[PDB]
Symmetry: C3
């Protein structure tokens, strides 16, 4: 029908909301400068054939922070946990600071002061970090050709 199925794999998951669908983190993580990771959404979707999903970066977080989301391509009928392919592309300049930075590049004040690497970010459980955009995909048969028509 004209409806997309969504399964919540955990009590940490969070239903998407709408043009593109806001995707939420299911875990709290701390990324150091240049650290890679795959953030679990604990959400799965059943995209019908003739469609590919795009788990792509959000504009707010991406423009404001060094959090770089490589757009994931959700294949039609892939039912696994959707993971955010992320890298804190902030330069590892060896410096230190007492402040983590949220997904709005603002400092997180700590009641218990800790020492962090400069350019570190914290993603909180249930935060809007990505979004899902579904678009039609064309799958034709391939033809080995010596020269095009």
């Amino acid at each position: 029908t004209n409806t997309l199925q969504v399964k919540l794999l955990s009590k940490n998951a969070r239903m998407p909301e709408r043009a593109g669908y806001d995707i939420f983190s299911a875990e709290t993580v701390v990324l150091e400068p240049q650290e890679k990771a795959v953030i679990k959404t604990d959400v799965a979707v059943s995209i019908p054939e003739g469609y590919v999903g795009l788990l792509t970066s959000r504009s707010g977080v991406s423009s404001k922070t060094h959090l770089v989301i490589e757009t994931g391509k959700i294949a039609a009928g892939y039912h696994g946990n959707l993971g955010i392919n992320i890298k804190n592309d902030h330069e590892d300049d060896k410096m230190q600071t007492i402040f983590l930075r949220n997904i709005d590049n603002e400092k997180i004040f700590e009641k218990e002061r800790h020492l962090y690497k400069l350019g570190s970010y914290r993603i909180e459980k249930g935060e809007r970090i990505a979004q899902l955009v579904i678009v039609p995909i064309w799958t034709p048969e391939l033809k080995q050709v010596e020269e095009f028509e």
Copy 2:
């Protein structure tokens, strides 16, 4: 109809040209190694429903330079100024040089010699830095599901 509306927000803006639409800068800026920014196009568009716009990187500039454009997703019926989400991902190696580099990685000769950080780029007002690609988006209603069909 079969026509996309385009509004010029400034005397610095520049009409797009065509497969994908060439987007022009409306400002001259200088990005240091690892500097983030949002370059204003001074251009706005009214994308109809059932379509999402993609303000994505150009092939020439992106392959030739360290100028990294995170593809923007222009939602159907967003009428604001389109901004290029960019980062000069060149490593900040602390070195210095007398040359800025254009969007073709070539050196810019300065009649008035200045000291710049190595790996700096200059985007000129009215230069082709990005392009707009519009594609159909699918928006179905979401259904909370315990298991897929």
Copy 3:
């Protein structure tokens, strides 16, 4: 018809395979930390009008390695050699190691021990490094407008 033409430009090329089409390298290359490059596929395609191709990153390699593929936008009816726009975004920390890393971040054991820069990768001729995803593109005529409807 309902068929996409594919031409092999070399004896090093390799036919794509299928949701998205797996793209193979036609050359063996070694990328140092922060090195840019355009990897030749030795493959050309004739995408019909009303469609744009997306030479985008693979999930395995991209999430596992620092190999960053800026998604290429293959315009309808572009018949040139498809090249992978890549950057080894691993930080140039000046360190050295005897191991190259494959597209699975695993160490490559060398029978002839050599000295490499830490965070270097090797792409092998005939490896799955990218994939092609074709989606419909909308090309309307542009209208200069003082205010939207």
